[PDB]
Design an enzyme around this catalytic site. Structure first.
Site, PDB file in Angstrom:
ATOM      1  N   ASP A 196       8.508  -4.884  -9.201  1.00  0.00           N
ATOM      2  CA  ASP A 196       7.634  -4.418  -8.149  1.00  0.00           C
ATOM      3  C   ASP A 196       7.755  -5.497  -7.091  1.00  0.00           C
ATOM      4  OD1 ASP A 196       6.865  -4.330 -10.961  1.00  0.00           O
ATOM      5  OD2 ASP A 196       5.144  -5.596 -10.417  1.00  0.00           O
TER       6      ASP A 196
ATOM      7  N   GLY B 232       0.801  -1.203   0.000  1.00  0.00           N
ATOM      8  CA  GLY B 232       0.000   0.000   0.000  1.00  0.00           C
ATOM      9  C   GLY B 232       0.841   1.264   0.000  1.00  0.00           C
TER      10      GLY B 232
ATOM     11  N   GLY C  66       6.746  -5.876  -0.381  1.00  0.00           N
ATOM     12  CA  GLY C  66       6.911  -4.715   0.473  1.00  0.00           C
ATOM     13  C   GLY C  66       6.395  -4.980   1.868  1.00  0.00           C
TER      14      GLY C  66
ATOM     15  N   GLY D 121       2.542   2.359  -2.697  1.00  0.00           N
ATOM     16  CA  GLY D 121       2.343   3.008  -3.975  1.00  0.00           C
ATOM     17  C   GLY D 121       3.126   2.381  -5.109  1.00  0.00           C
ATOM     18  N   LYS D 122       3.661   1.189  -4.879  1.00  0.00           N
ATOM     19  CA  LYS D 122       4.457   0.501  -5.888  1.00  0.00           C
ATOM     20  C   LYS D 122       3.739   0.198  -7.236  1.00  0.00           C
ATOM     21  N   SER D 123       2.543  -0.375  -7.153  1.00  0.00           N
ATOM     22  CA  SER D 123       1.776  -0.748  -8.333  1.00  0.00           C
ATOM     23  C   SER D 123       1.448   0.440  -9.217  1.00  0.00           C
ATOM     24  CB  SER D 123       0.470  -1.429  -7.914  1.00  0.00           C
ATOM     25  OG  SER D 123       0.666  -2.319  -6.821  1.00  0.00           O
ATOM     26  N   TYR D 124       1.091   1.553  -8.597  1.00  0.00           N
ATOM     27  CA  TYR D 124       0.733   2.751  -9.333  1.00  0.00           C
ATOM     28  C   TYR D 124       1.930   3.282 -10.079  1.00  0.00           C
ATOM     29  CZ  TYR D 124      -1.647   7.421  -9.976  1.00  0.00           C
ATOM     30  OH  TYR D 124      -2.228   8.560 -10.486  1.00  0.00           O
TER      31      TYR D 124
HETATM   32  N1  ADP Z   1       0.916   9.247  -6.398  1.00  0.00           N
HETATM   33  C1  ADP Z   1      -0.302   8.724  -6.348  1.00  0.00           C
HETATM   34  N2  ADP Z   1      -1.349   9.402  -6.936  1.00  0.00           N
HETATM   35  C2  ADP Z   1      -2.618   8.857  -6.892  1.00  0.00           C
HETATM   36  N3  ADP Z   1      -2.997   7.711  -6.337  1.00  0.00           N
HETATM   37  C3  ADP Z   1      -1.924   7.054  -5.753  1.00  0.00           C
HETATM   38  C4  ADP Z   1      -0.604   7.482  -5.725  1.00  0.00           C
HETATM   39  N4  ADP Z   1       0.192   6.577  -5.059  1.00  0.00           N
HETATM   40  C5  ADP Z   1      -0.662   5.608  -4.701  1.00  0.00           C
HETATM   41  N5  ADP Z   1      -1.940   5.838  -5.083  1.00  0.00           N
HETATM   42  C6  ADP Z   1      -3.168   5.040  -4.778  1.00  0.00           C
HETATM   43  O1  ADP Z   1      -2.785   3.909  -4.097  1.00  0.00           O
HETATM   44  C7  ADP Z   1      -3.311   2.725  -4.718  1.00  0.00           C
HETATM   45  C8  ADP Z   1      -2.237   1.742  -5.093  1.00  0.00           C
HETATM   46  O2  ADP Z   1      -1.143   1.581  -4.179  1.00  0.00           O
HETATM   47  P1  ADP Z   1      -0.324   0.283  -4.528  1.00  0.00           P
HETATM   48  O3  ADP Z   1       0.641   0.603  -5.611  1.00  0.00           O
HETATM   49  O4  ADP Z   1      -1.312  -0.740  -5.000  1.00  0.00           O
HETATM   50  O5  ADP Z   1       0.440  -0.277  -3.263  1.00  0.00           O
HETATM   51  P2  ADP Z   1       1.675  -1.246  -3.095  1.00  0.00           P
HETATM   52  O6  ADP Z   1       2.221  -1.504  -4.459  1.00  0.00           O
HETATM   53  O7  ADP Z   1       2.745  -0.677  -2.236  1.00  0.00           O
HETATM   54  O8  ADP Z   1       1.147  -2.502  -2.474  1.00  0.00           O
HETATM   55  C9  ADP Z   1      -4.133   3.098  -5.917  1.00  0.00           C
HETATM   56  O9  ADP Z   1      -5.445   2.514  -5.779  1.00  0.00           O
HETATM   57  C10 ADP Z   1      -4.003   4.641  -5.981  1.00  0.00           C
HETATM   58  O10 ADP Z   1      -5.231   5.364  -6.015  1.00  0.00           O
HETATM   59 MG    MG Z   2       0.153  -4.504  -5.343  1.00  0.00          MG
END
Ligand code: ADP
Ligand code: MG
Length: 321
Positions: A236, A93, A239, A95-98
């Site tokens: 990715d 959570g 985390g 922001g890696k996937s985004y």
């Molecule tokens: N810079 C950003 N701008 C807009 N939304 C973001 C941003 N960074 C994260 N998000 C939000 O967070 C979510 C995804 O986080 P995610 O990449 O899935 O987490 P992680 O990869 O660490 O498990 C999306 O649903 C998105 O709306």
């Molecule tokens: Mg993910």
């Protein structure tokens, strides 16, 4: 180059957790007040991406931005050969996937989607009648040292990460198919990302999106095409390490950084077999082949330790090649 950090406005769990922000320059500010102290520090961090607000906020780290900064440059090196990497590291959570695969709709894309696209455009713009490149790509998930052909859902004729005495590490066939046509390629990803869906525990894994850019130059001096390949790996990794479940995944990598982080006295035998993930990427991680990183943080004060944990040994990525 090699490092950057990105914070996410706020997620549900956060939005209702009446938790505001601690992470406010070119460096990362990190406070906590629930201990007293002012520290830690700001740390270098080539890039301290600020994306706390709304893509309407003039002062906002736009998606296109992060790319034109890390990815763009990282794609350039590829053209001039030399392989490269880009890992999204984090805390579930974070922001890696985004920051790597964002979201399908216009705007909210990752660096992956943009990178190829560029590549593709980069190639068709053309200029000369002897290019010949051909795009080769693969999308694997590394789970419990157990890969998975997100490309070919039912995989087959496979096992783990085998080592080619000379060509380097790879895997038993897996899935490798050209396509050439962003749209063609774009598709691949899509199908992929879906191949994974069990809270989505697809977290205890890491997805590697590697592409094989082959460059064929025409001599124009005694006909003699020249094979010039480049390897482009964007990952990715998992985390966040309540800590129900473990596995090399992290550690493996957790070991490499301590490595590339250990020169002293001016300017090795490199230890990464002991790191299955690093395995997947030989030279591009151990000397040769530049490499950059992206860490995603959570504005929540409810997450001051894990994130901070991230910043630190993120700052740690300062020593190797
Ligand atoms: N810079 C950003 N701008 C807009 N939304 C973001 C941003 N960074 C994260 N998000 C939000 O967070 C979510 C995804 O986080 P995610 O990449 O899935 O987490 P992680 O990869 O660490 O498990 C999306 O649903 C998105 O709306
Ligand atoms: Mg993910």
């Amino acid at each position: 180059v090699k490092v950057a950090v990105r914070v996410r406005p706020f997620n549900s769990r956060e939005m209702s957790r009446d938790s505001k922000c601690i992470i406010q320059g070119s460096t990362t500010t990190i406070v906590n007040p629930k201990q007293p102290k002012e520290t830690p520090k700001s740390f270098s961090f080539d890039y301290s991406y600020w994306s706390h607000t709304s893509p309407e906020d003039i002062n906002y780290a736009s998606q296109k931005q992060v790319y034109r900064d890390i990815g763009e440059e990282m794609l350039q090196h590829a053209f001039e050969g030399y392989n490269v990497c880009i890992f999204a590291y984090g805390q579930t959570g974070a922001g890696k996937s985004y920051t790597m695969m964002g979201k399908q709709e216009k705007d909210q894309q990752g660096i992956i989607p943009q990178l190829c696209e560029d590549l593709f455009s980069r190639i068709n713009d053309t200029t000369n009648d002897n290019m010949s490149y051909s795009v080769e790509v693969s999308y694997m998930e590394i789970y419990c040292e157990r890969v998975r052909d997100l490309l070919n859902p039912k995989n087959k004729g496979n096992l783990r990460v085998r080592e080619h005495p000379l060509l380097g590490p790879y895997v038993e066939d897996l899935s490798k198919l050209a396509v050439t046509s962003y749209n063609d390629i774009q598709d691949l990803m899509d199908s992929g990302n879906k191949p994974r869906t069990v809270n989505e525990t697809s977290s205890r894994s890491h997805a590697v999106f590697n592409i094989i850019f082959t460059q064929k130059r025409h001599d124009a001096e005694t006909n003699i095409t020249t094979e010039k390949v480049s390897k482009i790996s964007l990952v990715d990794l998992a985390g966040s390490e309540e800590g129900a479940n473990i596995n090399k995944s992290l550690t493996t990598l957790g070991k490499v950084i301590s490595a590339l982080a250990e020169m002293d006295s001016g300017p090795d035998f490199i230890p990464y077999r002991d790191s299955v993930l690093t395995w997947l990427l030989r030279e591009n991680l151990g000397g040769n082949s530049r490499t950059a990183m992206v860490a995603a943080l959570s504005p929540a004060d409810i997450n001051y330790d894990e994130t901070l944990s991230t910043l630190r040994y993120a700052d740690r990525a300062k020593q190797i090649r």
